[PDB]
Design a protein around this ligand. Structure first.
Ligand SMILES: CCO[C@@H](O)[C@H]1CCC/C=C/CCNC(=O)c2c(O)cc(O)c(Cl)c2CC1=O
Ligand SMILES: CCO[C@@H](O)[C@H]1CCC/C=C/CCNC(=O)c2c(O)cc(O)c(Cl)c2CC1=O
Lengths: 211, 211
């Protein structure tokens, strides 16, 4: 199953590089941004479903789910939102707001503003050096978009991950110094602090050895 | 990705049908049998690794993991044991002990003996009307064996489920009256009662909405 490679729009590559290298202290803001995106996508499939009810049948439950995978130093944020087609992943995430945030930043702006420029997605590079966005739109097959903050990303038809009925998974490969975001306590503390007013259930998946 | 269909050896079909239909009370024994199988497979990759250390690299952690999936009425039991090749799944599970258990049964035997006849796998039909066995041996690709207790099963190259590095997942589609096995409390109670002496960590995956 062959990967396709695409070039990032120049300013996006610009944004990603300063973030992956930054010494900024409050890296935990990435989670609010990703939950905010998840909530948005859930709004869209819900609003969409107002006039097209069958759009919900691929995954009737509306949720945001966070799943620590300690062994792989991975953190996943899933939602059963509207999802993105292959062409949406390519367009939305790489090939097409941005520059103005970098300008605000260089003047003293707090990266927490990132979401107000519409580019909070990229805040994930505060805690991760690599990401896979796995997405299933009702309108397309399941696809994997992958980036390590370089100048190019890949998109691959998904034959390796669990089927999500509909929606998007952000699979973050955490940096070695950022492994705290795998911890149930840390995660819950960050959720409560910055994501108080979310319309959808936020589920936390915890793995505990029984005794 | 095309399915292949195989016929069950007659006595196996025999065994499965009486179990899926039985009014037997103590259906919870299925879990000890599946944990026992998981432990066995883990023994085999560990013993195997004694003379062939690199066999462990596909999945360095040795664990048994149970994952309730309430939305799908599914219960998964995973291990990172030795796993089964496509030919092993076909051979082991369908096409090749058994009859003597059915004879013990018809004389008054308790189905809890099933494991002593080497066929405890089939006890899963006490709680499930359908199963998918997903397996990855170091020696083959990932495959899905599926049965609903009929006279035939299917085997399909796996392009739809998460990659397991190595091992086996039993995905049980629980009957409507058996949904109690999705419950953290129930599961823990059954583990402690019948699986006290297990050499490997038994991990329980619990999904909890945060507030
Ligand atoms: C600037 C890049 O574009 C994005 O940020 C957008 C894409 C366009 C805007 C909204 C589209 C609807 C579907 N959204 C998603 O699938 C999505 C999600 O369900 C969680 C996320 O964490 C991100 Cl990232 C995205 C994708 C996402 O939020
Ligand atoms: C009678 C049918 O044969 C089986 O029962 C056997 C297959 C032959 C014996 C042992 C083989 C080593 C690998 N075992 C597995 O992958 C396995 C597992 O890791 C969990 C299970 O729950 C079952 Cl079921 C099996 C498969 C299993 O235990």
């Amino acid at each position: 199953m062959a990967s396709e490679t695409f070039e990032f729009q120049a300013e996006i590559t610009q944004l990603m590089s300063l973030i992956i290298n930054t010494v900024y202290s409050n890296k935990e803001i990435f989670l609010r941004e990703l939950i905010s995106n998840a909530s948005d996508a859930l709004d869209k499939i819900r609003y969409k479903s107002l006039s097209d009810p069958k759009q919900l049948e691929t995954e009737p439950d509306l949720f945001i789910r966070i799943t620590p995978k300690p062994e792989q130093k991975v953190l996943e944020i899933r939602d059963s939102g509207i999802g993105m087609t292959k062409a949406e992943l390519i367009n939305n995430l790489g090939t097409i707001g941005t520059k103005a945030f970098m300008e605000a930043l260089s003047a003293g702006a707090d990266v927490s503003m990132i979401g107000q420029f519409g580019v909070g997605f990229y805040s994930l590079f505060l805690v991760a050096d690599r990401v896979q966005v796995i997405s299933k739109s009702n309108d397309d097959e399941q696809y994997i978009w992958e980036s390590n903050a370089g100048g190019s990303f890949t998109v691959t038809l998904d034959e390796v991950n669990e089927r999500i009925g509909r929606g998007t998974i952000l699979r973050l490969f955490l940096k070695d110094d950022q492994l705290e975001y795998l911890e149930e306590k840390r995660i819950k503390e960050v959720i409560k602090r910055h994501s108080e007013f979310v319309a959808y259930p936020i589920q936390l998946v915890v793995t505990k050895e029984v005794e």
